[PDB]
Design a protein around this ligand. Structure first.
Ligand SMILES: O=c1ccn([C@H]2C[C@H](O)[C@@H](COP(=O)(O)O)O2)c(=O)[nH]1
Ligand SMILES: O=c1ccn([C@H]2C[C@H](O)[C@@H](COP(=O)(O)O)O2)c(=O)[nH]1
Lengths: 316, 316
């Protein structure tokens, strides 16, 4: 079934990864170097063996696609994926007068008091970003994130390059190009980033009037992260195909470090005992073609009928 | 046997690639997205089913490793891999007074007269680079090539970053890093390069005191190119391991477009009828550890006993 390579990656890490106690005090199982395809003509790979929220994934890809780096657009779709990194900024600023919120990463997952003055300051933070333009401009804006990496990569000559729109125009004029590459990885920023990008670069390819894409993902959370990563790039592959008048081919997912936090063993095992369902179907608005000016309503999921969601603690 | 994944890639493209008539008037068979490992503890992957010149490959990696971008170092080891791109520069300059040498790519492979005034100007060109310092500085120097990408990546703030030496020091201090990445791909240069790099980026990983490396190669000549590419990165993986006091793990080779020019079908088939031999062994100078100051004599191949070389026309 469409999603099986996903369940094969999980199983593979379960009985072959090594214990590697990295970035934290937790531990992981880990493999290095893996690859899996999905034939996108067979259906859209949104995992049916567990409920994944499509709205979150599409509202974030559009954000990237408009080249936007400000959280406000996300909060306006009840998308909180990125609040942490913005709010963190806030928290170490001079204009900040409140509970010291040092290491709320862990601290809001132990202390259950703390973790309530935490959705305190956040709800308060998010709200100001929604309403106060200058605050939004000051702390709502991440700076180095996919949207500006893809569409506004800073040159040294001090201009700004739109890799993604240049590449798309290359696909129309020279589809047989072996050079259709978008990279999110700038070595002059990379050492001072709180998150050097996980999705490092991708490559398009066309043959027989079909578009494929291959993603090199440097580091991957098999349980929480990869389910999302997959639908995100398979969606991009549909948008680009749609804009270039092309058919859709495969999405190829290549990994460097792929891991499973040990706090997730039970949850992944439960999942591995479910039987995939037939995959959902994507539907794009046939009248609109300029994919940079796409809206939520222009992208539809059909026949998604997952098993229930699986709550699981996030990585500390 | 060690080299089999190489023969499996060939076979795979032979009976599954599609005809794609790209960059030229020739044609190729093509697949997109492939991956293969080599367990470097089982021996060094220099193809035994055909004679590959190790001297060429090591003298070029050292060049990259010293961060050098001038051909002269290569010519001093009878390494001509890169003459073309240098000489091309020469040929369109004002100081050039000679036969017009337009499109000597093809032109020296049809005309057999031309192709003799061609090793004329070249032998003449190479010689001046060897002897005339200022000429060497003017036309011997490529500019954007792996050596300066790896070790002298230009910032916009106008400095110069040594990604490779920074990463190596990260491996010593933080081997469990999921961030050990060197990229050769600058989007502000990429559109004005005669050859946007084929070897796009690589990633190191350590576990159980073993070093692995994974290479994302965007575009690959299965017959002429890939045999070299493989020994080049498996060598890098040994050098770095040796410098960091580590054991050697696997070399993982990931491809985007992997192709076979149609002019190579017979030659690859002949090769596929030979039976691999036991692989050779690498030997590094145990006393010297600073790998940036390695010399030819510090790296030895043992027990390489290939089948004969296979002449084949280059791609036009
Ligand atoms: O979309 C995403 C974003 C992040 N990660 C995770 C995996 C790692 O736990 C973390 C990166 O930590 P470092 O890899 O940068 O050390 O990001 C994913 O799997 N998918
Ligand atoms: O070490 C190398 C260098 C080059 N190539 C080839 C494959 C392609 O024929 C060519 C690149 O042409 P474009 O891919 O840039 O279009 O480089 C290799 O396979 N290995």
């Amino acid at each position: 079934m469409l999603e099986q390579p996903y369940l094969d990656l999980a199983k593979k890490v379960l009985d072959e990864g090594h214990f590697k106690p990295d970035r934290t005090h937790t531990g992981t199982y880990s493999i290095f170097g893996h690859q899996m395809r999905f034939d996108l003509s067979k259906g859209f790979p949104l995992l049916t063996t567990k409920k994944v929220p499509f709205g979150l994934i599409k509202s974030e890809l559009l954000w990237f696609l408009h080249g936007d780096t400000n959280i406000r657009f996300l909060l306006q779709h009840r998308n909180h994926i990125w609040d942490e990194w913005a709010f963190e900024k806030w928290v170490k600023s001079d204009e900040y007068h409140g509970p010291d919120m040092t290491d709320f990463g862990h601290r809001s997952q132990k202390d259950p008091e703390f973790a309530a003055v935490y959705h305190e300051e956040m709800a308060k933070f998010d709200d100001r970003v929604l309403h106060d333009d200058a605050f939004a401009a000051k702390y709502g804006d991440l700076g180095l994130v996919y949207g500006s990496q893809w569409r506004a990569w800073h040159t040294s000559k001090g201009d700004t390059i739109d890799q993604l729109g240049d590449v798309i125009e290359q696909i129309k004029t020279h589809p047989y190009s072996r050079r259709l590459i978008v990279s999110a990885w700038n070595p002059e920023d990379v050492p001072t980033m709180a998150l050097p990008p996980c999705h490092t670069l991708y490559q398009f390819y066309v043959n027989d009037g079909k578009l494929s894409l291959q993603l090199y993902q440097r580091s991957a959370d098999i349980f929480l992260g990869v389910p999302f990563n997959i639908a995100s790039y398979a969606l991009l592959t549909h948008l680009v195909a749609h804009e270039c008048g092309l058919e859709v081919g495969e999405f190829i997912h290549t990994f460097g470090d792929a891991h499973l936090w040990v706090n997730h063993l039970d949850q992944i095992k439960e999942q591995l005992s479910r039987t995939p369902r037939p995959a959902p179907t994507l539907q794009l608005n046939p009248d609109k073609h300029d994919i940079f000016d796409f809206d939520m309503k222009d992208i539809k999921l059909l026949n998604y009928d997952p098993y229930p969601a699986i709550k699981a603690p996030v990585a500390v």
